[PDB]
Design a protein around this ligand. Structure first.
Ligand SMILES: O=C(O)CCCC[C@@H]1SC[C@@H]2NC(=O)N[C@@H]21
Length: 294
């Protein structure tokens, strides 16, 4: 589907100023009526577009937009698809499985059909593909994903970001991002993450205003590095990193595996990513479940 116009559209409105269809139509080369039409779409996307008869149209606040140019600008190789508007980042790659290479990617700020459980540009969506030579992963994998993501965020300045075994990023004990892995029966995986940029906790909301093009870029970079590191040394190289980032480490949690709630103190992960729950002076690992403050 061709979504160009509204994007071009959104692009003008970007500068959080006022814009009249007359104004607009000029530049776009179309009926104000045409414009009204597209304006509606942005609206459909959850875009915030105000309309003052006398005034014209505008956005409540300037916004930043993905820009492949910028993104690919700071990137050395690998295919990367920038689709501000899309069904789902994961699906997109899932769909192209035979045409990819580990590292190929896809970036969006709007998902019209996200997999795994949100207004345009309020979030950042990233998905990557990787072919693991040897399920020499899974749980390892998700771990590495949150490490890095949390690392990068930090570099750009969000220092209190933390990881939550085994797949979310946390900020002030709130969820900020979410990883999603998908295997395909050499393993073929599709990694996908969503971050809360703006508006249960958002970068904005926490005074952090990162340049999305940058973030986008860093992650891709950093990710491919991480993944190749992992591909040949597994978890080991990250053990210490996990620990420093662990949000719950040493805190009292409540683990929910299927139908049972289990309480205990978190003591991080083992060399395999299993969480280590200490109950009644005993420490044992857990390979699954859902962690939670308590
Ligand atoms: O939704 C989340 O919070 C956690 C799961 C993350 C889902 C990611 S968002 C990018 C990728 N594309 C999808 O369709 N889902 C995943």
């Amino acid at each position: 589907k061709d979504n160009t116009v509204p994007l071009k559209l959104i692009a003008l409105l970007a500068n959080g100023e006022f814009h009249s269809g007359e104004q607009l139509g000029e530049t776009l080369g179309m009926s104000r009526a045409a414009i009204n039409k597209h304006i509606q779409t942005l609206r459909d996307w959850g875009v915030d577009v105000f309309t003052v008869p006398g005034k014209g149209y505008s956005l409540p606040e300037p916004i930043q937009l993905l820009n492949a140019k910028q993104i690919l600008g700071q990137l050395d190789g690998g295919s990367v698809a920038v689709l501000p508007v899309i069904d789902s980042t994961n699906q997109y790659l899932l769909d192209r499985i035979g045409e990819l290479k580990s590292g190929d990617a896809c970036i969006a700020e709007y998902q019209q059909a996200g997999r795994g459980r949100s207004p345009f540009g309020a979030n950042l969506y990233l998905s990557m593909f990787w072919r693991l030579e040897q399920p020499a992963a899974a749980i390892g994998l998700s771990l590495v994903i949150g490490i890095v993501m949390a690392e990068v965020l930090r570099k750009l300045g969000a220092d209190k970001v933390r990881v939550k075994w085994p797949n979310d990023l946390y900020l002030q004990d709130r969820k900020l991002a979410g990883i999603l892995v998908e295997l395909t029966g050499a393993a073929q995986i599709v990694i996908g993450a969503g971050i809360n940029m703006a508006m249960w906790i958002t970068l904005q909301e926490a005074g952090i205003n990162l340049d999305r093009n940058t973030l986008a870029a860093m992650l891709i970079r950093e990710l491919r590095a991480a993944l190749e590191l992992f591909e040949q040394e597994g978890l080991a190289p990250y053990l210490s990193r996990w620990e420093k980032l662990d949000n719950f480490i040493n805190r009292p949690v409540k683990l929910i595996i299927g139908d049972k709630e289990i309480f205990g103190i978190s003591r991080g992960i083992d060399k395999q990513g299993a969480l280590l729950l200490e109950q009644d002076g005993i420490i044992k690992p857990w390979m699954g479940g859902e962690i939670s403050l308590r």
